[PDB]
From a paper:
[name] is the central recombinase enzyme that catalyses mitotic homologous recombination, a key pathway of double-strand DNA break repair. [name] is regulated by a set of conserved ∼35 aa long BRC repeats located in the [name] tumour suppressor protein. BRC repeats bind the C-terminal ATPase domain of [name] via two conserved tetrad motifs, FxxA and LFDE, each located on eponymous sequence modules.
SP24 and [name] were significantly truncated at both termini to remove residues that are unlikely to contribute to binding, as suggested by the BRC8-2:[name] crystal structure. A different linker (DVP) was used to cyclise SP24 and [name] instead of DVT, which was used for SP2. No significant change in secondary structure was observed for [name], indicating that the large cycle likely maintains a high degree of conformational flexibility. In the structure of [name] complex, the linker can be observed connecting Cys2055 and Cys1234, creating a 19 amino acid macrocycle. Electron density is clearly defined for the side chain and the linker arm on the Cys1234 side, whereas the other arm is less interpretable, possibly as a result of conformational flexibility. Remarkably, the LFDE modules of SP24 and [name] undergo substantial movement relative to [name] and the rest of the peptide.
Numbering used by the authors:
A (entry chain B): 2055 to 2064, 1226 to 1243
B (entry chain A): 111 to 226, 228 to 284, 309 to 349
Amino acid sequence: CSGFSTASGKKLNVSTQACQKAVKLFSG
Amino acid sequence: GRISTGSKSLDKLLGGGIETQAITEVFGEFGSGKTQLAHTLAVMVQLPPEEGGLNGSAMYIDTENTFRPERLREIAQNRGLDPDEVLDNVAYARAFNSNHQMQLLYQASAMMVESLTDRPYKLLIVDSLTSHFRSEYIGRGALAERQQKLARFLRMLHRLANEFDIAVFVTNQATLRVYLRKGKGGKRIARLIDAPHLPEGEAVFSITEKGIED
Ligand SMILES: Nc1ncnc2c1ncn2[C@@H]1O[C@H](COP(=O)(O)OP(=O)(O)O)[C@@H](O)[C@H]1O
Ligand SMILES: *CCc1cc(CC*)nc(N)n1
Ligand SMILES: [Mg+2]
């Protein structure tokens, strides 16, 4: 999982469920 | 909404700055200021509208390993802003290939829905839109797949710009195309491309300790 971090260095996480919801809403 | 570039001259050419619900594409040769303009916008979007911003957060997808948090700190300090706060309002991700670049848009969309807070995302930067496509299709430039993948990426960017009311800013070595170049004496010049009914002239800008400015 290589995703986003704040520019200050703090990893920003997206849950597997939130990820799936975004793919569902925007993949089709 | 419009985000100031930091330069009053370039803002005037752009009708006030880069627009939300739109993709602004800046193209130009290496060293023309594309990445420096992206870094400046990532700070400007955080300001109130009276100061050129949209009270928002910025998202930065880097495909060329040229994102510099220390540059955001310098731009913030030289504009009178708290550097630690500015860095906390910029989410950044390196994309190592074209598949990863597209995957990061799904993660971006999840972060955008969650931020819809007193500082929602208002800017998404892709620096650069085409570097990975160009490297992955060397010797295979005629393949339709390259254009089809880029078309899918742009379609997703337009969807994000409209759904979240965010300005999308992309670099290339497009609701609005801007060409950056160097003229006599290292003068940096911007002009609009294939933009009928929009200013046909050029705008001079500078790159300083404040980022982009007149
Ligand atoms: N911190 C800085 N202060 C002032 N000028 C800078 C700074 N960082 C980079 N520059 C200038 O920015 C220019 C490169 O711009 P850049 O956005 O990297 O171009 P491009 O992305 O189009 O290749 C160079 O002239 C460089 O000296
Ligand atoms: C772990 C990073 C990531 C993000 C996405 C979209 C939410 N998909 C995948 N497979 N991995
Ligand atoms: Mg660059």
